Design a protein around this nucleic acid. Structure first.
Lengths: 262, 149, 143, 129, 141
RNA sequence: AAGACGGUCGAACUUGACUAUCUAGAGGAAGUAAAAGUCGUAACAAGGUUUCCGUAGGUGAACCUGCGGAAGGAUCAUUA
RNA sequence: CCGCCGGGCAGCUUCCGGGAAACCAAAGUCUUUGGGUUCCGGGGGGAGUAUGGUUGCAAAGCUGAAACUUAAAGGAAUUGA
RNA sequence: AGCGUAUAUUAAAGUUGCUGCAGUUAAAAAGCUCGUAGUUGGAUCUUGGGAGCGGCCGUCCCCUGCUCGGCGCCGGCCCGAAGCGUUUACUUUGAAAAAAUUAGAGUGUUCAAAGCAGGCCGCCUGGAUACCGCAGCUAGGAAUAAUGGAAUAGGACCGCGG
RNA sequence: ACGGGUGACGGGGAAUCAGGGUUCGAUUCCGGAGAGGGAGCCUGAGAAACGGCUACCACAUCCAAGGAAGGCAGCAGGCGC
């Protein structure tokens, strides 16, 4: 390497894209954007592989160059634009709106939302900051810089922003007894209520989360997103509601629905 | 088996079960302590004090008559000699062998037995260094080992 | 006593020419529950590389060896012992790795054999990357 | 010199059993020996035993039955993980039906059956079958 | 195993590491000299030019002559006695013919009653000896 | 702009020095394999002087002899 | 003179047990294999040779290969001559 | 629709032996003791108690203290949170761990090697899961094995001069 | 340790396997290094780049003899081995 790399081989592509082997050598290396390369869903992948609207990368090119698809209330004419967590994908001509939040397993589900819910999103604040005139500053998980915020919002809270104005409406404080979706590690997509936070000065602080059915699991603080106050999520969830039942239970449910079909 | 010999000798003391002092003994803790003080100040090792007591006065063991060991009595009173009374005896022997060997030059046996005694001095000296009975600077050197009596 | 080197030795943060009509001292608690020791606050020595009265931040690892050598200038060699586990023979082997570590004149008397706790800092010299943060006097050592 | 005390205790039981004695004398007794022999007894390979108590290391007189084949030590005391009990008791024990590996866990000194039961590793001391 | 301490790993390992040299096959592989001395230089076969034919007298109780041929390797220039196997196969091999030469079977050890012959001829000027023997190919004129 | 002084990084060239490998080798000297050559007979039966060991001298050749060992000896033993 | 205890040089005896056996209360307690530790062996030759190092005045000592050759060399015991 | 040969290498090889080899005579124990690293080191310090439930038996819970709220009760008792608590190995748990391969669940690529597809008269569905030594991180346990505390009392605690 | 050797780029992995293990891993994925051998630099956010430039060493093409131009361990293909 003598500079930045531009090709991403299909075997090196993040596993949650569920890309087949015998299609090609390469996968779409996501163009730089708000979310990380590893943890996004490129617009070509979501449009062609998941929705099956297009068949080839040229067909996706033909769609995205007619200004149809709108990511977070702005038109994105880049077929490998990184669409990541909490992002709101509205297609106007079809009349359909998707919020990219995780399946109960470590992948992105294709969760349809209503016109009135596809008008805002939840942003995890990353670092608070003072500018060049004692003007306070936020930085969120999706690279948004919000200045003149509410003077109580701190480094691990969640803010609800509007996708026209880009201004803070209401916020959920990071407390014990607040709903959190886990957005990294083994427990990727698990929804549960924060039970404890265990402080380790110099190391990564681990946070205990309780599922609805009394399933207790820990995650590092970085891989947690407060998505609701109490047991009330301020968004709509996929079918499953983030439980991640065992493989024996998933089998039982599968062949239950199978034998019921007959 | 012995440290520096092929022998496997089984000959030592056999203490009885009952640690209780017998009825006939009228010597109390302070009376034997006065006796031990007198014997040590006369010029006598913890070993020789112990045998004098059990032979003549009839003191089975001082650890039962008193609550202390003879050296802990003497080092509490401040009558304990500095370098211990087994390290002392090993140096004393080693000087006695070397003084013989300086004259009788062709004594190859005395040369071999001197090496064995000195290996035993070093090996016990370093035990006392770790247990802080000696300074870390303490040296056994045959040049000025006779300065130690 | 101090200012032996040709350049003037001062804590460069504190200003010592305030017109009037004792010298002040800059220090810091270096986090992770380490007591900024008494000699740091009440000494008159100068050190760039003291974690208390200098410009080094402690971050990363916190390791501990035994003091081996104290024959170089404001630096010591600690000896770190561990058991490496060979897999074929279900047994260990005794290894060691001795590192040059920066000792502040803050810790006034450390004896070779003392137990040290060291915090990772930026590279201080060619081989020095750690700083002595607390000393625990070796078994007994009262007299 | 006497570096392993459990090793000599179990060898002296083994020779006494082979020779066809009704009871045996173990010289330097210890918690680990008494805790080994209680595990043996609890399954019923030895009868009762009486630890003779001088003001030193004690002595044990063990009532032997004729239903013990072998009782052996494993020195050194290896760190048997729970996932390694199988591959230890595969090559140490005669069958999957009888025989026991006593190993010193955090709970106490107990056989592979109870170590599996309580979900615990530890260190192998010996075996009896 | 003799020493059984729980940290005697470098002892047991270093002991075994030293004592593997006393194995005849291990040393013959891991020292250079066997490969450095091997005419083939650690290869399956080798091509070489026939420079004369030779009648090697067989060993004891066996009483015969062996239809060997003296061959010079192309890549080394080392000289080799190669045994021409089957009955009257020496009549297809004339001099200045390049031959393909294999080992006999026993990995640089003299096979049968043929004294000091490691190698055997398999091809004669790009034609198999099996082919020229069984009458499948004729010699390239 | 060409050009020049100096510094610097520095390929490479010049004469020596050492050393890793290849290779010719008068000639010397061994070990080995070789169907019946010569000179003996050192060893295995007390092998015709019991054999072997360490060291030293000697000799066509196996070997011989001195000093001190060993039984793997040809004596588990020899009598008041 | 008669016995007992502990260390030592040995002896006799037996289905302790082992071992290929001769035999060994140790050369036993070993597929029912794990008390502690040092040295050291890997078919027979080539060869304790060559070479390098080191020690010695010399003789020589300690460390110590390879190419190449070879299907056996050898151990205990049996029956013959 | 393949089989023979040559060579490197694995199992056979318990002929490299950690599991697991041998050392009187088959190959092998330094001539003999001394000795620093290395390796290994005797016994000994918490046993014993409260109460539950099934048929004397079996398992379930109960064993160190010193500032901010309500289950509340009346400055208190309780429960909680931010701190504290000789070190170390050991063991179990959690986190963090690229895919591909390997193991492995689903699925008639006509079977199979593979592949990640597919299935039902627009709809319904997958794309799981385990494994990843050692070192580092985290939380329980305290048998086993190291290590520390008072012995010139410069000992712990409690109070008074300061 | 220092030095020397590697038919040594490292790892994910591969072959063989009772349980241990032994051998392989140039080879499509990740990381590194190189563009005939060394060295020096321009431009640019990023190069000590070679399908960039400047020297010397080795080789080598075209010459109106003054000069001009080189770099397959890219895809094909040729000689040598």
């Amino acid at each position: 390497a003598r500079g930045p790399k531009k090709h991403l081989k299909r075997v090196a592509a993040p596993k949650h894209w569920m890309l087949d082997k015998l299609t090609g050598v390469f996968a779409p290396r996501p163009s730089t954007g708000p979310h990380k390369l590893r943890e996004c869903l490129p617009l070509i992948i979501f449009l062609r592989n998941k929705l099956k609207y297009a068949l080839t990368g040229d067909e996706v090119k033909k769609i995205c160059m007619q200004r149809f698809i709108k990511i977070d209330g702005k038109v994105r004419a880049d077929i490998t634009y990184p669409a990541g967590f909490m992002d709101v994908i509205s297609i106007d001509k079809t009349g359909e709106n998707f919020r990219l939040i995780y399946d109960t397993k470590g992948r992105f589900a294709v969760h349809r939302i209503t016109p009135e819910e596809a008008k805002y999103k939840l942003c995890k604040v990353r670092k608070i900051f003072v500018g060049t005139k004692g003007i306070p500053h936020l930085v969120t998980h999706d690279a948004r810089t919000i200045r003149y915020p509410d003077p109580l919002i701190k480094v691990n809270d969640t803010i609800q922003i509007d996708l026209e104005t880009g201004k803070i409406t209401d916020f959920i404080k990071f407390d014990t007894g607040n709903l959190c979706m886990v957005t990294g590690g083994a427990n990727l997509g698990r929804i549960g209520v924060i039970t404890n936070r265990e402080r380790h000065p110099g190391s990564f602080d681990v946070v205990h989360v309780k599922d609805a059915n009394g399933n207790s699991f820990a995650t590092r603080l970085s891989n947690i997103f407060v998505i609701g106050k109490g047991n009330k999520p301020w968004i709509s969830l996929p079918r499953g509601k983030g439980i991640r039942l065992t493989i024996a239970e998933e089998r039982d449910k599968r062949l239950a629905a199978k034998q019921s079909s007959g | 088996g012995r440290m520096h010999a092929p022998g496997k000798g089984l000959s030592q003391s056999a203490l009885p079960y009952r640690r209780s002092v017998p009825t006939w003994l009228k010597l109390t803790s302070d009376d034997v302590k006065e006796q031990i003080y007198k014997l040590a100040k006369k010029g006598l090792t913890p070993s020789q004090i112990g045998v004098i007591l059990r032979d003549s006065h009839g003191v089975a063991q001082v650890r039962f008559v008193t609550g202390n060991k003879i050296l802990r009595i003497l080092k509490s009173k401040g009558l304990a000699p500095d370098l211990p009374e087994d390290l002392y005896h090993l140096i004393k022997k080693a000087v006695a062998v070397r003084k013989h060997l300086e004259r009788n030059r062709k004594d190859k046996d005395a040369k071999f037995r001197l090496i064995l005694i000195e290996s035993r001095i070093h090996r016990l000296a370093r035990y006392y260094k770790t247990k802080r009975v000696l300074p870390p600077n303490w040296k056994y050197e045959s040049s000025t080992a006779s300065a130690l009596v | 006593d101090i200012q032996t080197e040709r350049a003037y030795q001062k804590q460069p943060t504190i200003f010592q020419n305030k017109k009037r009509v004792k010298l002040p001292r800059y220090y810091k608690n270096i986090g992770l529950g380490f007591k900024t020791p008494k000699e740091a606050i009440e000494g008159t020595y100068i050190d760039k590389k003291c974690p208390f009265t200098g410009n080094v931040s402690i971050r990363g690892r916190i390791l501990s060896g035994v003091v081996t050598k104290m024959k170089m200038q404001r630096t010591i060699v600690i000896r770190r012992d561990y058991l490496h586990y060979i897999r074929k023979y279900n047994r260990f082997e005794k290894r060691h790795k001795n590192m040059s570590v920066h000792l502040s004149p803050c810790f006034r008397d450390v004896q070779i054999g003392d137990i040290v706790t060291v915090g990772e800092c930026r590279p201080l010299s060619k081989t020095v990357r750690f700083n002595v943060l607390k000393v625990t006097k070796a078994a007994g050592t009262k007299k | 010199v006497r570096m392993n005390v459990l090793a000599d205790a179990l060898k002296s039981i083994n020779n006494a059993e082979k020779r066809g004695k009704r009871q045996v004398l173990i010289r330097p007794c210890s918690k680990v020996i008494v805790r080994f022999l209680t595990v043996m007894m609890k399954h019923g390979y030895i009868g009762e035993f009486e630890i003779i108590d001088d003001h030193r290391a004690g002595k044990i007189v063990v009532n032997l039955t004729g239903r013990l084949n072998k009782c052996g030590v494993i020195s050194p005391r290896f760190d048997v993980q729970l996932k390694d009990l199988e591959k230890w008791q595969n090559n140490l024990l005669p069958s999957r039906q009888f025989g026991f590996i006593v190993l010193t866990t955090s709970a106490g000194i107990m056989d592979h059956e109870e170590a599996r039961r309580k979900h615990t590793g530890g260190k192998i001391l010996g075996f009896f079958f | 195993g003799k020493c059984r301490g729980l940290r005697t790993a470098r002892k047991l390992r270093s002991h075994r590491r030293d004592q593997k040299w006393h194995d005849k096959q291990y040393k013959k592989a891991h020292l250079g000299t066997a490969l450095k001395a091997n005419p083939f230089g650690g290869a399956s076969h080798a091509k070489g030019i026939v420079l004369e034919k030779v009648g090697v007298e067989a060993k004891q109780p066996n009483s015969a002559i062996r239809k060997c041929v003296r061959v010079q390797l192309i890549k080394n220039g080392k000289k080799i006695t190669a045994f021409v196997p089957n009955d009257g196969c020496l009549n297809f091999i004339e001099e200045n013919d390049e031959v393909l030469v294999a080992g006999f079977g026993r990995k640089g050890h003299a096979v049968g009653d043929i004294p000091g012959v490691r190698f055997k001829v398999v091809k004669v000027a790009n034609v198999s000896l099996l082919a020229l023997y069984k009458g499948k190919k004729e010699r390239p004129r």
